[PDB]
Amino acid sequence: GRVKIGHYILGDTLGVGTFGKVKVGKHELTGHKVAVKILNRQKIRSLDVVGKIRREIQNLKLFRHPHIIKLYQVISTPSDIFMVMEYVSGGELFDYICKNGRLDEKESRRLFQQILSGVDYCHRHMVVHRDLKPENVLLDAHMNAKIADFGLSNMMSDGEFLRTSCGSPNYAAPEVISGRLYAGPEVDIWSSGVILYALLCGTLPFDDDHVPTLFKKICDGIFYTPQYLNPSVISLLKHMLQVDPMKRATIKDIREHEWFKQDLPKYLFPWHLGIRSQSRPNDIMAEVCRAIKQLDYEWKVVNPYYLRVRRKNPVTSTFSKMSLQLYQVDSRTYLLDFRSIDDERPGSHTIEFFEMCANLIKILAQ
Amino acid sequence: ARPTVFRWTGGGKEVYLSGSFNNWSKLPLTRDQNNFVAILDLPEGEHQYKFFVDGQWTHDPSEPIVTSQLGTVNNIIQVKKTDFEVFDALMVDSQKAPPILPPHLLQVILNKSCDPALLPEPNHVMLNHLYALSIKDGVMVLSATHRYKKKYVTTLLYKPI
Amino acid sequence: SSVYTTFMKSHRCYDLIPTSSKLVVFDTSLQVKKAFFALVTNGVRAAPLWDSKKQSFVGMLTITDFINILHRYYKSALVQIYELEEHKIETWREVYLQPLVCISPNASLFDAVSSLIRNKIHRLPVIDPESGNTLYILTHKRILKFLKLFITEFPKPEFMSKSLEELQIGTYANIAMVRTTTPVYVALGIFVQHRVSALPVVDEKGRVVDIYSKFDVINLAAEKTYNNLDVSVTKALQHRLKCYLHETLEAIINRLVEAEVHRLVVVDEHDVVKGIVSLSDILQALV
Numbered sequence A: 001g002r003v004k005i006g007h008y009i010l011g012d013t014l015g016v017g018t019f020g021k022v023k024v025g026k027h028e029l030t031g032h033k034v035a036v037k038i039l040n041r042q043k044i045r046s047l048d049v050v051g052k053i054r055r056e057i058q059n060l061k062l063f064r065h066p067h068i069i070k071l072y073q074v075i076s077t078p079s080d081i082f083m084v085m086e087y088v089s090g091g092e093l094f095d096y097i098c099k100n101g102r103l104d105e106k107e108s109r110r111l112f113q114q115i116l117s118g119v120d121y122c123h124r125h126m127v128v129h130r131d132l133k134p135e136n137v138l139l140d141a142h143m144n145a146k147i148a149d150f151g152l153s154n155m156m157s158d159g160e161f162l163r164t165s166c167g168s169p170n171y172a173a174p175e176v177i178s179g180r181l182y183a184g185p186e187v188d189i190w191s192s193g194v195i196l197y198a199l200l201c202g203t204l205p206f207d208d209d210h211v212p213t214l215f216k217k218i219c220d221g222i223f224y225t226p227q228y229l230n231p232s233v234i235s236l237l238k239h240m241l242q243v244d245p246m247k248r249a250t251i252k253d254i255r256e257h258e259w260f261k262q263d264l265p266k267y268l269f270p271w272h273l274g275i276r277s278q279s280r281p282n283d284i285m286a287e288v289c290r291a292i293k294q295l296d297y298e299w300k301v302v303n304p305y306y307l308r309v310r311r312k313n314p315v316t317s318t319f320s321k322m323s324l325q326l327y328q329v330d331s332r333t334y335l336l337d338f339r340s341i342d343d344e345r346p347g348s349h350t351i352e353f354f355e356m357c358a359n360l361i362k363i364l365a366q
Numbered sequence B: 001a002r003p004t005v006f007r008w009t010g011g012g013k014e015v016y017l018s019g020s021f022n023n024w025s026k027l028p029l030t031r032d033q034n035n036f037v038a039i040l041d042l043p044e045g046e047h048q049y050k051f052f053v054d055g056q057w058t059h060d061p062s063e064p065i066v067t068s069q070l071g072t073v074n075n076i077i078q079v080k081k082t083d084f085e086v087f088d089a090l091m092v093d094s095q096k097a098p099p100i101l102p103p104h105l106l107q108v109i110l111n112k113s114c115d116p117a118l119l120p121e122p123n124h125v126m127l128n129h130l131y132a133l134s135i136k137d138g139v140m141v142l143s144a145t146h147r148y149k150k151k152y153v154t155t156l157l158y159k160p161i
Numbered sequence C: 001s002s003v004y005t006t007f008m009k010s011h012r013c014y015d016l017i018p019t020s021s022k023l024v025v026f027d028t029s030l031q032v033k034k035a036f037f038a039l040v041t042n043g044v045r046a047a048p049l050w051d052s053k054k055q056s057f058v059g060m061l062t063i064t065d066f067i068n069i070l071h072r073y074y075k076s077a078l079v080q081i082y083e084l085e086e087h088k089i090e091t092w093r094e095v096y097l098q099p100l101v102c103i104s105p106n107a108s109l110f111d112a113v114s115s116l117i118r119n120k121i122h123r124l125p126v127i128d129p130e131s132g133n134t135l136y137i138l139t140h141k142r143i144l145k146f147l148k149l150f151i152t153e154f155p156k157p158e159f160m161s162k163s164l165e166e167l168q169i170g171t172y173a174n175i176a177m178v179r180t181t182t183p184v185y186v187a188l189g190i191f192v193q194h195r196v197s198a199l200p201v202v203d204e205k206g207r208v209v210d211i212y213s214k215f216d217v218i219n220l221a222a223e224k225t226y227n228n229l230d231v232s233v234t235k236a237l238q239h240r241l242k243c244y245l246h247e248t249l250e251a252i253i254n255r256l257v258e259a260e261v262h263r264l265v266v267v268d269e270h271d272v273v274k275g276i277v278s279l280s281d282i283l284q285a286l287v
Ligand SMILES: Nc1ncnc2c1ncn2[C@@H]1O[C@H](COP(=O)(O)O)[C@@H](O)[C@H]1O
Pocket: C122, C170, C171, C173, C174, C175, C176, C177, C195, C196, C197, C198, C199, C200, C263, C276, C277, C278, C279, C280, C281
């Protein structure tokens, strides 16, 4: 009376995962092995991580890339939620680097092209696997890289940033460790940047046993480059490991890079914002809400610096919405940004937004 | 196949599971690492069970009980239809200073000799955002890039104020 | 029902919408001089109008509007055109023509060409029925540029081989032409009363030296030189093609698209021309 989910006899626990226990499943009849994430409904009920697990399920569902661990099925029982996935014999790329040495230039690149390939597919689907590390990059029998924990992944939205500063300290981007909000893919490039370092060197580019000093190292963007390293790869790392996101390499910038280009298999790839006010951030919110009330617009308060304002069209009798988020530019200045909230016909949505916005600017400060 | 995992987060050398679903017969729980486990496919409905933990019968006090008219205390499980749809099962489980301006909202596609009515593919992150020109001869110029399907359109409103 | 008719009937307007474009909208309340300046400073031959009070796009502002204002209200080179300098768009639209023609992105290119000829227009706003907003402005040039892609790869029918003369495409009767000495004011006049887009400029000798067009007129706005229209058409063109009757429709189409021009002067044996063929006529003859 051995534990099994259908014809898959469950075996050894290969890991604990971001969410649930990952066990092996060798098929009773065919001997086919699968990896099974067991999300215990007794533990998932507990938090509001219920969303963070519906996010992993939903994202991963439609994917099918050669270097992303495949989701075969997701089966729900009263007890738990099982996620049947493709199983690989090689385990952690991390343990491979530990056990074997640093990877040779040829091998380092081979594996890097694969990890970047998967990472590209992800972004191309507006999915961003925050928490990219060799611990989450698995190897198969002929050691092809396979991306694996989409628990800390997230769906990129049109006109929206993301805060959740997640992932292992070493592999976490300066803006992540800093807590500042990012677009998404910059972050995965900075992680893929350290992965390449670990590949060619066998060590980490930013490391310290004291966490805050490590955080400073990461933000200083300064790391060692051994003599054995090729200057061309050094230049690529210099670009991926840029502290400023606006100066940091893009997947395109990497595809364009000569080091990355060498022996690449073809199967892998195919005016100013808002109004700025120098007033007190609380006083700005105060100034805005008495101006919103003036325009008779309805609204709801999310964050103290975030408002969702609605407006009944006096002519077409239809509703128009916008997101008002206060930011901070200088050490002395503050900026108010107007984003459109696309509803779901008699008069244009786009122009109705401009009108709603202009009506406010007509009275507000600088 | 949708089997229900029974767990025994207790101690013990030998643990068994007796249920209505197996006609009150001692089914052995396999010691995982932490708990003693068994996985059985149980149909939609009410099911009572108990545990034989080291020659002593008990319910899991953690799990719901049911006391009979006869004095027997058994555990109980309601296997609902909701317990099978992955997203339906997800819903049933539910029950200081302003941020620093991200650098991506400073890059304007209107700012940066082909078509004058032709612009580059904008970064998704600035779609729906309001960028306005300084108020001139009593005229305020407003712009926003929006996407319709695989196409992007930067609309410019020339509005007197 | 030619192959092109069935080709245009198959393709959505959306297909012609570029990957990332600019769209300039004017509120009807905006000053009319500002409106024209904006067309120039943004680099766009036209812009849709928005009535904020009516909460709908009530029309379009083109160079044709400038040509009609600039002519109706030009008192002299000594007195500034008051009306233009102090009119709103809504006040001028009240003067002229005392409704907005558009198309859905999910509508055929056939319905788009049909609309252009049927409504006797050059600009066609593509407006989304779902959102209610204008996405792109469909021009004859864009439509023919794309149709060209089809006929270069697809085998040419018998009528494409035939001559412009024997096919009878384009206006050849009562062709409005200007002279070298003709002033800009007279030129605008002809544009207004003859409803034409361009006027060929003949020499004192009689050979066509140049060509004045609705587009040339915007340089008056651009170079802020509009206040004197007494200047000869040649003096105006100081800021800065042909075809024969006997030529094939194919050869003619290739020239119109390559040159990226809106018409071709149709010459006889000599410098002096027998008529004019336009993109409108080419597109009407393929739909
Ligand atoms: N100079 C001209 N004289 C007479 N008809 C013209 C002239 N230029 C264009 N047309 C005609 O005007 C119609 C519409 O063309 P267009 O206004 O040029 O887009 C066509 O039938 C043209 O042949």
